[PDB]
Write a protein that binds this ligand. Structure first.
Ligand code: HEM
Ligand code: HEM
Ligand code: HEM
Ligand code: HEM
Ligand SMILES: [Fe+3]
Ligand SMILES: [Fe+3]
Ligand SMILES: [Fe+3]
Ligand SMILES: [Fe+3]
Ligand SMILES: [Fe+3]
Ligand SMILES: [Fe+3]
Ligand SMILES: [Fe+3]
Ligand SMILES: [Fe+3]
Ligand SMILES: [Fe+3]
Ligand SMILES: [Fe+3]
Ligand SMILES: [Fe+3]
Ligand SMILES: [Fe+3]
Ligand SMILES: [Fe+3]
Ligand SMILES: [Fe+3]
Lengths: 158, 158, 158, 158, 158, 158, 158
């Protein structure tokens, strides 16, 4: 079904966001794993998979809309060589993505692409979940100090 | 069954106590949850529910006694913006409630409202449980430091 | 995540609505129970619990949004000393709440707080359920007369 | 298999009858449901589905007979704004349908379309079931009064 | 609960759309079945049932909104005497329905009938599913030719 | 129980029809099987068995009616050396049988042998099933071509 | 454990190969899915996941070797707007990857990085599997024609 060009563009933009998150989240995860921070690996890993699913949703939607998914262009990744830096990177990435989503959502509404709008709101709902988690962890680092915090990541959370 | 006016008054007073505890305990719980202190959330939550049950007991008793439950008037809540402050608030709230209970109990005895008396003693038994827990937790914060204590609240206690 | 001030205000307003419903619905329930109207007790009770859940959703959202939940200020409760009066009170309360919701929803949309918007729409969906139920019951009182209607409430609906 | 034109015509006529019943029965059902008359909703609903099945039988038979099912032309629906009026409408609708069936059956016999005849007799058997139920219900309203009758429709019949 | 007149009108319009789809989808299904195209029968049948459910949702909503469902007026059906023609008819019907939905949705938003809006978006979500399916099938007819395509419909898809 | 002579005669005539169908259907089946057309073998086989059952019904009825079943006289079989020819043979055979049935049925009615009549109508119901299937298959051969059609007969239809 | 720089470089190169395959394979998959070619979707999807796993193996190895995984730089993707073109693209991609692997393997051997060598040989073993499948499929398109081939991709292979 032919979709709005501007909409399809937003979709690809959003898809681009996910593609970046996938890679960042995944690398961070294995870095945590490499460092022996199992708890953190599990989390990041999971979040990474969620972005993979969000991306799949985007790709399928664009395709349905008879558009062309853009997986070629990859945005800048901001790794970080320490736990807090990494969490702060993700956070920043998430905040930006949310920013784009809200813009895209408002647009879909005006062009009456309600099915795309709803999809994005669902994804936004998820993103805000990643946001909360990341902020809460960052706050804990500060509250209990890094050494205790890291001690808390060595074992998998049952 | 027509009950003693003075008794029904004590009941409503006690009910008022519970109504305040419900809200305080519940807010504190979600605040802990928001902060990532699962263990603390679970506890506060549970205690909050206990208050809700106590209140139900009160409401039903007053109604049986052909009185009028008072849910309109809500006492002052003392939140607190930090773990210890919050626990200290609850503690203070609990101590006061107990104080009222003892007064109410002694009164019910004199007016021969033994069934109300026994109910209140049961509830008192519970409250003192809340008291012990609270004191114990406050003592622990002091004993191991806040950073270790907080670190201990992150995971739910299986 | 820092949220829109105006939004957080609406949230607390809505939370205030629920807090009132919780108390009204709960008292009415036990009043019905006291009167031997099991069917009615079960219903009101259930509805009361739903408002408790709606309130929890509000509290957590405000907290996430780095705002301050308001459980201190309690609106006016309108009890009623008879079945129909009570149902009419609830109805009125529900209608007002819905009115506020629609206002809040429209606002969240404009400020692009889509996740809050969606939450509220879900809650609205529920509220309208309470509305339908209450109207339908009120219509039946009139249609079969009070004596038959009350006869219909003595036993729990399987 | 090429069928008798006149027969196929009767079939479509009968199909038309069913199409009307489907809509009437279904609307009445939801109206009852809307009014809180569960027992009545269940019944009407069920009857509505039966009509849908009858229609399917008709459609398939006409098609087999290499004819053209007529779903375009919809007869007059007679709703009714009250329980008895609605039941009386259905009754009237059913009586007419039966009238047509008998005519169609007698005709199929003469043209030797025995397989169509038998099908219709089966359907007739069903319709007369709808008839009995309807009459019985109308008689009951009269016998116990509308208020008692309505009171009896609130709960689903286990 | 009294609803917006204009909204109720859109609802009935949408209901009218479904009523047409029900009949078209159902007839096409049995036509496919008559032709020995099981796979196609199953699909159309299923889709037909979905429109029946969508219609039920509409009817109940209008009723709740204290409006009058319109099942009397039936739109034009466009059958088609061949597989592709039939699929193209459905497609066209679906596209139009979606067109109406988007209009209705945008309107409900402005009048603040958020619960109706959300319902419609859900239904729209479904409709677009029918759309995708129908386009994909039409594309396959062209890609593998009719004779192979029909060969592919004789057996039920497990 | 002594039955009408003329009726018993029709019965034997009908029995004769079945005896021919049994042999034709069975031979065709194994021919299909021999050719590797499993799907077709299964079908023909099944149909062949149905004829066998029909015959049993006839034999038992005639015997009950104190008549003499005629299994000695076997009508002309029309095999055919190709799929379509075979299906066309069966079709012709079925059409004739139906023709006889209708005649027999009408007769049983006049002589008041209602139990025989009903039996025959049941059997007729079955035969028309064989008819539909046969026509449908012949239509498909034409529609998709013989090569695609044959390709579709190789595997058993699960 | 500090690893050979040149080795780590090969690893990242190989990782880069996988990153490209992930995206290409995944997009192709959903494109097939969008087109209704389930069988093809399942395959591509699976292959896409394999690439994801291979990449994970690479990332973890580089990290262990105290190197820096490179997920930022994404090679050129060659989509293709038709089934054969897509399969040919993948094939080409796979052939190149294998080419790099063999080079990397031979190198690891000389530098005595046997554990990396073995890992790569395992991955190579997998890739050659992807290769065979691809060639086989391309050969089949040619052998049976595209129309028959496509017809064979519609249903998932149980
Ligand atoms: C601060 C406002 C309140 C909040 C946020 C709240 C919240 C809750 C929640 C979330 C539940 C669990 C619901 C479920 O999962 O099914 C619950 C249960 C309950 N609440 Fe409340 N509540 C509040 C006030 C009250 C009041 C005033 C009463 C009246 C005494 C009350 C009585 C109850 C009862 C009887 C239960 C059921 C516990 C059980 O299952 O045994 N609540 N509440
Ligand atoms: C007034 C319009 C109609 C409405 C509102 C309606 C509604 C429904 C609903 C809600 C169901 C149950 C679906 C489920 O839960 O899976 C159903 C089933 C069904 N309907 Fe309809 N329908 C309508 C018209 C028709 C027509 C015209 C036909 C064609 C004869 C038809 C044929 C069927 C059939 C065959 C079933 C399946 C029953 C079974 O499971 O055996 N309906 N309908
Ligand atoms: C042309 C000669 C016939 C052949 C080659 C034939 C073949 C068969 C075969 C292979 C079976 C399945 C046996 C099994 O696997 O259990 C069967 C079943 C049967 N046959 Fe025949 N048959 C013939 C004639 C007849 C006749 C003349 C009758 C009498 C009416 C008859 C009545 C039956 C019955 C009642 C069954 C059991 C059906 C069931 O499974 O419920 N057959 N036949
Ligand atoms: C083109 C971008 C990508 C897409 C669209 C994508 C998509 C997916 C999807 C949909 C799943 C299944 C999720 C589930 O159902 O739970 C998955 C699994 C997975 N992905 Fe990705 N992915 C992409 C890139 C990557 C990358 C770069 C990596 C890093 C090497 C990766 C690693 C994984 C892993 C390890 C799994 C789990 C497989 C298992 O369960 O064993 N993915 N992917
Ligand atoms: Fe995401
Ligand atoms: Fe995210
Ligand atoms: Fe208490
Ligand atoms: Fe307490
Ligand atoms: Fe609520
Ligand atoms: Fe409510
Ligand atoms: Fe009927
Ligand atoms: Fe009927
Ligand atoms: Fe629909
Ligand atoms: Fe549709
Ligand atoms: Fe037979
Ligand atoms: Fe036969
Ligand atoms: Fe690989
Ligand atoms: Fe590969």
């Amino acid at each position: 079904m032919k979709g709005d060009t501007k909409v399809i563009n937003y979709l690809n933009k959003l898809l681009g966001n996910e593609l970046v998150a996938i890679n960042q989240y995944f690398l961070h995860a294995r870095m945590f794993k490499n460092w022996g921070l199992k708890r953190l690996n599990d989390v990041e890993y999971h979040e990474s998979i969620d972005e993979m699913k969000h991306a799949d949703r985007y790709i399928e939607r664009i395709l349905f809309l008879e558009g062309l998914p853009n997986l070629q262009d990859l945005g800048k990744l901001n790794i970080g060589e320490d736990v807090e830096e990494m969490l702060r990177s993700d956070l920043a990435l998430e905040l930006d993505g949310a920013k784009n989503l809200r813009e895209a959502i408002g647009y879909a509404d005006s062009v009456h692409d309600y099915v795309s709008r709803d999809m994005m709101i669902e994804i936004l709902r998820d993103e805000e979940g990643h946001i909360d988690w990341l902020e809460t962890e960052l706050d804990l680092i500060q509250k209990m100090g890094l050494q205790n915090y890291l001690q808390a990541q060595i074992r998998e959370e049952g």
